[PDB]
From Swiss-Prot:
Record function comment: Regulatory subunit of the ATP-dependent BRF-1 and BRF-5 ISWI chromatin remodeling complexes, which form ordered nucleosome arrays on chromatin and facilitate access to DNA during DNA-templated processes such as DNA replication, transcription, and repair. Both complexes regulate the spacing of nucleosomes along the chromatin and have the ability to slide mononucleosomes to the center of a DNA template. The BRF-1 ISWI chromatin remodeling complex has a lower ATP hydrolysis rate than the BRF-5 ISWI chromatin remodeling complex.
The name this protein goes by in its record: Bromodomain adjacent to zinc finger domain protein 2B
Tissue: Expressed at varying levels in several tissues, whereas a smaller transcript was expressed specifically in testis.
Subunit relationships: Component of the BRF-1 ISWI chromatin remodeling complex, at least composed of SMARCA1 and BAZ2B, which regulates the spacing of histone octamers on the DNA template to facilitate access to DNA. Within the BRF-1 ISWI chromatin remodeling complex interacts with SMARCA1; the interaction is direct. Component of the BRF-5 ISWI chromatin remodeling complex, at least composed of SMARCA5/SNF2H and BAZ2B, which regulates the spacing of histone octamers on the DNA template to facilitate access to DNA.
Residue spans crossing the bilayer: none
Subcellular location field: Nucleus
Homology family: Belongs to the WAL family.
Domain spans labelled Bromo: 9-113
Organism: Homo sapiens (Human)
């Protein structure tokens, strides 16, 4: 509270670390469904069903332009990518499996990079 400060983690490396994690996402072989925005004019249903589309290139633009206030907002967007993928795609599909794979890959790097 007022004049009662909680000690807080050093966040000065966060931007560089998130960029590093995102680069590893982008270069993963199963990254292909998520590299660009889904084409809302070519994929029936997508615009109406998925209220907040997100993809790596959009995350990369936001990261590069100071649009994430903190590392949690960055992680919300990354997870949004895989949550959208699960909403729209069957688990037993190439894209669907790609998403499950990429989520697992992200979550480990996230724990390995930040959680002590
Ligand atoms: C992630 C997703 N979910 C539902 C429909 C399509 C997609 N991705 C597409 C599949 C191949 C690449 C395109 S994209 C995103 O490059 O236009």
């Amino acid at each position: 509270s007022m004049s009662v400060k909680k000690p807080k983690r050093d966040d000065s490396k966060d931007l560089a670390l998130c960029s590093m994690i995102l680069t590893e996402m982008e270069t993963h072989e199963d990254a292909w469904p998520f590299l660009l925005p889904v084409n809302l004019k070519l994929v029936p249903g997508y615009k109406k069903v998925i209220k907040k589309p997100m993809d790596f290139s959009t995350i990369r633009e936001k990261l590069s332009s100071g649009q994430y206030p903190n590392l949690e907002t960055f992680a919300l967007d990354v997870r949004l990518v895989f949550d959208n993928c699960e909403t729209f795609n069957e688990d037993d599909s190439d894209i669907g499996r790609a998403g499950h794979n990429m989520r697992k890959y992200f979550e480990k790097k996230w724990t390995d990079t930040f959680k002590v």
